[PDB]
């Protein structure tokens with residue numbers, strides 16, 4: 001009997017893979033948001049190693065948690081461990097793609113999406129964050145996210161989202177969705193809304209559940225009330241959730257393959 | 270009874286990375302120590318120069334010149350080596366001034382005192398351990414001024430998060446030999462030690478919320494932050510510990526801060542001069 005239960009836990013073939021990474025200083029809620037993402041589609045220690053966690057939704061969703069980077073006294077080249085991980089998956093894929101083993105289906109561990117967490121300071125972006133995002137954008141789709149958005153009043157949040165958008169433009173930071181890859185009027189219309197209003201996504205994370213309106217929901221219980229993570233009246237996690245998992249999942253993979261990976265392959269060959 | 274002149278000068282400096290509510294708390298300190306007033310509309314600009322703001326304050330009937338020194342943030346660059354040197358320089362510049370002035374060739378009855386008596390070091394509520402830059406920065410400052418660690422934006426935390434983080438900060442500071450005020454080395458007897466043990470092990474670091482804006486709560490206007498869920502009241506002990514910090518620095522330990530500054534820190538400067 002005990003043996004019989006073991007095979008059941010072993011287990012689900014999937015049609016495709018999607019891989020998201022979270023990146024930024026320690027203490028910004030990255031690991032919490034990883035768990036939040038997983039609990040939206042079904043104490044946390046400091047993260048000391050890059051770790052990939054997968055779950056079947058059929059698709060295999062992998063979320064890659066990372067140690068804090070860009071939070072030290074000296075941060076020169078602090079992006080290199082992340083770059084190394086990303087390029088390792090490109091190299092893996094390159095060799096799998098030649099396909100000597102003649103598989104029908106090729107495993108894809110490449111990072112299709114990188115959530116870059118920005119601390120909610122109210123002020124101009126850190127030069128370090130600008131530099132970090134610049135290096136990452138060369139090799140992966142970057143999506144800027146404002147961490148711990150419950151830190152901000154409504155006015156502070158609007159002001160800061162606008163500041164971040166302006167400073168990304170001024171500094172020439174490539175982030176997804178890139179205007180360069182808008183196909184038509186429908187894409188330009190939807191993506192302009194995303195670029196100019198929705199982004200950067202101001203999120204709150206929690207893997208704790210509370211009953212609100214007689215329903216179990218993800219929420220953050222502060223001493224002043226329960227912040228409902230998936231309620232758009234409370235934060236923008238649901239906008240981020242739907243953007244990455246529903247509306248632009250396929251687009252993120254296509255840019256990853258046809259642009260970032262092809263750039264890797266070009267340089268490799 | 271009461272007179273126009275101030276009894277003494279008291280100088281507080283706020284230090285920490287940008288975006289931690291430092292400049293806001295500067296404004297909060299002055300507003301808590303004072304009328305019907307319209308709230309600030311414009312955002313406080315990023316602080317890019319060291320700036321001393323002074324006002325005559327009353328506290329328990331006595332007038333003091335309270336100066337709060339606002340400072341630029343740090344830690345936001347690729348390379349933050351030696352980012353404490355500008356603050357160290359200001360602190361030493363005041364010691365130097367006092368040294369040149371205390372000779373008192375002008376025969377003044379009172380000597381103007383611009384020395385930093387108290388330095389509030391703001392720590393981001395990160396949940397884990399301290400940031401290495403913060404540890405190093407505090408380690409350097411603790412050798413030349415009185416440091417009090419403060420958890421910034423404490424409304425960021427749940428009650429359990431706040432409790433654990435306070436302990437983690439204390440443990441980190443102790444393991445690293447960081448002698449923040451009240452320094453154990455200067456504990457003079459058992460009564461002193463028993464009392465300062467409580468401060469070091471329970472009171473500190475203070476978890477604060479800052480706001481120089483006022484909102485009506487149950488018929489009274491109070492300092493607070495207006496969130497979608499409610500008003501976080503800065504001077505309410507049930508909401509945060511700003512009131513404890515203010516009372517500690519302005520009333521109960523003000524003179525002790527000044528004495529440690531003059532008899533220890535300033536004397537070490539003067540000896541090394």
Ligand SMILES: Nc1nc2c(ncn2[C@@H]2O[C@H](COP(=O)(O)OP(=O)(O)O)[C@@H](O)[C@H]2O)c(=O)[nH]1
Pocket residue numbers: 025026027028029030031032033044045046047068147148149150151203204205206395396397425426430
């Ligand atoms: N205020 C606030 N705190 C959060 C949020 N998400 C996580 N936290 C807390 O922030 C601290 C660090 O979270 P963690 O997930 O470990 O961050 P990481 O170091 O970036 O992985 C913990 O105390 C969390 O409970 C959030 O959305 N808002």
Ligand SMILES: Nc1nc2c(ncn2[C@@H]2O[C@H](COP(=O)(O)OP(=O)(O)O)[C@@H](O)[C@H]2O)c(=O)[nH]1
Pocket residue numbers: 121122123151152156286287288289290291292293294313314315316342421422423424425477478479480494
């Ligand atoms: N959540 C929270 N935000 C605060 C607090 N105090 C200030 N702020 C906000 O934090 C941002 C930066 O404040 P500022 O005083 O300029 O910080 P400084 O750069 O350290 O001087 C502003 O949006 C403030 O309104 C606080 O106690 N809690």
Ligand SMILES: [Mg+2]
Pocket residue numbers: 030031032045046047065066
């Ligand atoms: Mg983590």
Ligand SMILES: [Mg+2]
Pocket residue numbers: 291292293314315316339340
């Ligand atoms: Mg400031």
